[PDB]
């Protein structure tokens, strides 16, 4: 019932076959979870400070684009 376990291994396999991989070890199903978790921590830790400076109890997509720009991987469309 862990929230981190909500990322399912066929969806992990879905992104894997999006990346186009022949075979995968089963070990990766938590390693990708940890990588995604620390990346989400990296962007959310800045996004909450962004909306904290905005002094609102919301989180807009502009804040996420600013957080990705501060991470250095800027995003379009929003």
């Amino acid at each position: 019932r862990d929230n981190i376990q909500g990322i399912t291994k066929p969806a992990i396999r879905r992104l894997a076959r999006r990346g186009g991989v022949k075979r995968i070890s089963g070990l990766i199903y938590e390693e990708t979870r940890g990588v995604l978790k620390v990346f989400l921590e990296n962007v959310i830790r800045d996004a909450v400070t962004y909306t904290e400076h905005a002094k609102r109890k919301t989180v807009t997509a502009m804040d996420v684009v600013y957080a990705l720009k501060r991470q250095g991987r800027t995003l379009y469309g929003f």
């Binding site: 929230n3 981190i4 909500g6 990322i7 399912t8 969806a11 879905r14 992104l15 894997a16 076959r17 999006r18 990346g19 186009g20 991989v21 022949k22 075979r23 995968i24 070890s25 070990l27 990766i28 390693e31 990708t32 990588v35 995604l36 978790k37 990346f39 989400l40 921590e41 990296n42 962007v43 959310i44 830790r45 909450v48 909306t51 609102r56 109890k57 919301t58 989180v59 807009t60 997509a61 804040d63 996420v64 684009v65 990705l68 501060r70 991470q71 250095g72 991987r73 995003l75 469309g77 929003f78």
Partner: protein, 103 residues
């Protein structure tokens, strides 16, 4: 007598399918749950008004970042001349990302 296909090869059919379909690949609700976990982890347990279109923006951004690092790891493992993949390949590619993958 029934008989079915070789391993790997019809998964490449799904690979060619997913490289043609540009949609999201993560179920929205577990991803929203797991990021609400992190904002509870940073806002001293309180929750914030998560804008719904911002959710799918972050969903697509994390998906693109993850498939990028994924194929990078598969490329380094194929440089190591083995057709499958290991977490040590992801570990090397994470290490040979620099601080771009860490901010």
């Amino acid at each position: 007598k029934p008989h079915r296909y070789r391993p790997g090869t019809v998964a490449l059919r799904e690979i060619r399918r997913y490289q043609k379909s540009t949609e999201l690949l993560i179920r929205r609700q577990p991803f929203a749950r797991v990021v609400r976990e992190i904002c509870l982890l940073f806002t001293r347990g309180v929750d914030y008004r998560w804008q719904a279109m911002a959710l799918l923006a972050l969903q697509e951004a994390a998906e693109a970042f993850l498939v990028h690092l994924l194929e990078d790891a598969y490329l380094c493992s194929l440089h190591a001349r083995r057709v499958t993949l290991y977490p040590k390949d992801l570990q090397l590619a994470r290490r040979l990302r620099g601080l771009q993958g860490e901010g």
